[PDB]
């Protein structure tokens, strides 16, 4: 066998956290933020947050909705629409008349790039250009890339892309958005919804029997866990509060930079707290925020973590980042789908597009007879949602879901072609599937780090060994039909 192409999907590179207040109204006045329009619409120029802040307020004062509920919105937004990423989704909800009855108002801040994924993303187009020059140095002048719109994900295509030609400047030709392919898409939102209201009586209720819902043997329930991270939040809520009421707040780190400062760390675990002070209230979506920041603080505010906890890797908050990496590791993934049913029409409904181009390039790049790559730089929704399709596939493979690593940063999904010209001209080719979690570490709360903050990245895993190309075609290709 010889290396003929890469296909390889790319998750965006270290980012600050995801964040989202979400609140659904049905007063005309949040109902006109729509402006007619009957799908999700997003907003994110500043000056038309700037204009929905100032319906927001009027909203308050005319009790157009929820006071209470609509202050934090309007205080966030004022906060936040000077920051890059925030943006406002209005999803509309349709009666049988196709009138819109209702509208979603998700608020979404943070998910930049930080500091630190510029190295990541130099990291591995550093490799894959040393990779190609040992196989084949033609790959170099047939590379294609696609990115995400999503400004973390392109930002990390860039700096891979920077790495791989050895270049300075870059050109807008070279790297070509497919919103299309690599942006999440709400087509499985109707059933990840499903999903979503199934989870709350596991988490909440004291007992619920979960059909085909992988969790480990040494935990107890989800709901006692949840029950003891509440606890634990509480508690250290109460350490932060007495720590900056009464200690120089400025001197528990030697080092404060952008992005990296005790008063964004304070607002967001004051939003944390007001979200897990009450286990039968628990949101799941919130448990990838929770998990989020934490890796965040410890990677990048390591020393404020320890001292703005510190009552007088501390016990109590060690305890609460491992039981936090629990939930983050069998309740998020599950998001997406818990029985293999829902994984695979979830999977297709957001990823059959992206799906069908992969295996039409990889199919080109069997006819070829220069040697190429393609590389898609994605939402972190995709990668998921695409492994899930490959083994609800029927494809052999060589681990278990169960047993994968949990995703992290520029996690990478990657399809390897391999040709057999041999036997006379006939031509046969073979494709071996691999991953890689991306720079991830287990021990986020005892690794050591640099001013970098930087996160190496895992070898990639193998997932199939080398299979006929024709047969894991029709695998995937078989399911496409529902
Ligand atoms: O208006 P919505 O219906 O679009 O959104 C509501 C819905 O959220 P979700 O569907 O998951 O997105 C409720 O979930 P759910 O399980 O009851 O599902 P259903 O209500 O049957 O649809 C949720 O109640 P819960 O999960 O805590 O029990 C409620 O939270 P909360 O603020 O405490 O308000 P109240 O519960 O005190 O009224 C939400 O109100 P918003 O603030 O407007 O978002
Ligand atoms: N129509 C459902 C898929 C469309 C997708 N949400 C998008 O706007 O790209
Ligand atoms: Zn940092």
């Known amino acids: ?25 049905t007063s005309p006045i949040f109902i006109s933020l729509l402006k007619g329009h009957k799908e999700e619409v997003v907003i994110r120029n500043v000056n038309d947050l700037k204009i929905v802040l100032q319906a927001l307020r009027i909203a308050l004062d005319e009790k157009a909705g929820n006071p209470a509920k609509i202050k934090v919105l309007a205080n966030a937004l004022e906060k936040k629409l000077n920051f890059p990423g925030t943006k406002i989704q209005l999803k509309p909800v349709l009666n049988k008349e196709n009138e819109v009855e209702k509208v979603q108002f998700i ?87 499903k999903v979503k209201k199934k989870l709350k009586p596991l988490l909440r209720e004291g007992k619920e029997a979960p059909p085909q819902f ?54 967001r675990w004051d939003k944390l707290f007001k979200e897990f002070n009450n286990a039968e209230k628990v949101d799941p979506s919130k448990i990838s925020e929770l998990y989020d920041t934490m ?22 908050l060690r305890e609460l980042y491992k039981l936090a990496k629990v939930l983050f590791d069998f309740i998020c993934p599950k998001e997406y789908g818990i029985s293999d049913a829902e994984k695979l029409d979830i ?16 199919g080109d790049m069997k006819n070829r007879e220069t040697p190429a790559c393609v ?10 949602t695409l492994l899930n399709i490959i083994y609800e596939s029927g494809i052999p493979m060589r681990i278990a879901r169960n047993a994968l690593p949990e995703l992290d940063y520029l996690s990478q999904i990657t399809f390897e072609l391999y040709e057999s010209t041999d036997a006379s001209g006939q031509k046969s080719h073979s494709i071996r599937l691999k991953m890689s979690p991306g720079c991830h570490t287990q021990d986020p709360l005892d690794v ?11 070898p990639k895993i193998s997932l199939t060994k080398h299979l006929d190309m024709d047969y894991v075609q029709q695998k995937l290709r078989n399911k496409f039909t529902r």
Request: aromatic content about 12%; some cysteine; overall charge neutral.
């Open 347 to 362: 999977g297709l409904l957001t990823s059959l597009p992206l799906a069908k181009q992969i295996l039409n390039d990889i």
């Open 214 to 267: 992988a969790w480990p043997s040494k935990m107890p329930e989800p709901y006692l866990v949840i029950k003891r991270v509440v606890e634990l939040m509480n508690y250290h809520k109460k350490i932060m509060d007495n720590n900056f009421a009464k200690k120089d707040v400025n001197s528990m780190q030697t080092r404060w930079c952008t992005s990296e400062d005790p008063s964004l760390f304070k607002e």
């Open 107 to 193: 608020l979404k801040w943070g998910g930049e790039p930080t500091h630190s994924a510029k190295y990541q993303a130099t990291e591995l187009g550093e490799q894959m250009r040393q990779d190609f020059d040992l196989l084949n140095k033609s790959i170099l002048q047939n590379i294609k890339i696609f990115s995400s719109s999503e400004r973390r994900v392109l930002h990390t295509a860039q700096y891979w892309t920077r790495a791989l030609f050895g270049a300075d400047e870059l050109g807008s030709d070279e790297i070509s958005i497919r919103k299309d392919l690599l942006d999440d898409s709400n087509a499985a939102k109707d059933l990840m919804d």
């Open 1 to 25: 066998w010889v290396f003929k192409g890469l296909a390889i999907i790319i998750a965006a590179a270290d980012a600050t956290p995801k964040q989202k207040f979400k609140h659904s109204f």
């Open 295 to 316: 890796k965040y603080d410890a990677l990048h505010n390591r020393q404020f973590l320890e001292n703005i906890f510190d009552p007088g890797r501390f016990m109590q």
């Open 448 to 458: 050591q780090l640099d001013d970098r903050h930087y996160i190496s990245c895992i």
């Open 375 to 384: 590389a898609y730089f994605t939402k972190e929704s995709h990668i998921y």
